[PDB]
Amino acid sequence: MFRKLAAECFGTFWLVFGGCGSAVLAAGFPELGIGFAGVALAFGLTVLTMAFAVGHISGGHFNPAVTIGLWAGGRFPAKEVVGYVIAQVVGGIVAAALLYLIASGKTGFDAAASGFASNGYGEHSPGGYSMLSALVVELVLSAGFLLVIHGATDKFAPAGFAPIAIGLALTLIHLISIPVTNTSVNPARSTAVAIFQGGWALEQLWFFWVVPIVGGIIGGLIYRTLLEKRD
Template structure:
């Protein structure tokens, strides 16, 4: 249960910090943090929670990461569903908190016809810059693949794991710097689901892509790392 609570709180913080920065700070008049600030916020949430609770649960905070670590031989299949449930509950709880805070401002309303509404992900008309379904799928697949390669490499028993959280946090920052205009950046099915639930409409109907593409990318990364990159013990 401690592992599941760690995943709950870690994913809560990721969604609250990352999506919260997009909702409240990105476009604040004259002092807004912009895309770069939002990208950094997402990276910082993972970095901080990796050191806070990573030693308890492994610090996944993302169903795609759990699948990738399973494919890489680092995580047991029996724990996949419990971890994913804990991650989704944490993400939805964070989105609910963000919605409650946002509702405290007069005139707040979620426009489900607008790209990026309530920090949701999307493609086509719901992509921040109008990218197609195919473009969104490729971006999410490739970015999640490399995210998992970085995670698997940084946490390898032969690596200097003391700095793993920094590498992983910076990787997520870079991923957001690349892809916010494309999909509003997911690479995390729980993060996408949580925001889409509160938006509804087309963003909710598009959330399937932000489960399928990241999970496929993560699984491919796991197999690539295990078969092509992972260093073996000299005795093996």
């Protein structure tokens, strides 16, 4: 209840701080760009640690798409919905504020000002990350979270395996998804960037973001319907 809500909120702040810091840091990577590899290694470890730690501390799904899936299944906790909305809104501004602080002349200038969209190569990454490729990847990322959570929510969470399984896969996905398109990490981070970088011209991308979350809902929706069918 209150404890669970507080645990998720606390974890969100920590996750956002680490995500924003790593994101802004990557944007202003050192001239040598050597520290880039060191940061990536630390990020992966942190993600895994947070998943296991944040999991036992909250064990929350921590995802807007997941919350929606439950709603369709006839489950929509008021605390979860309220926390999700607040977390996203607050998390978005909080991340933007932190990023701006660094951009205040310190390495990690805003992508919009640099016109890097994020890090130079994004949804336009010729590495085969075009719209078609991005569409499949976006669905996989959203579906992956729902798939793991959906399953981990069925006597599939022995104790740490659930968070660890996703954590390990999450790091691997980010490791490749990063150099490919420099994917952020979650909707919260994306929202903060969209708030500022999501300029009308760039706002159009908002639709591209909707698909990812929507795609995940469709996958979870089918799973919920099937389960309800068996009853």
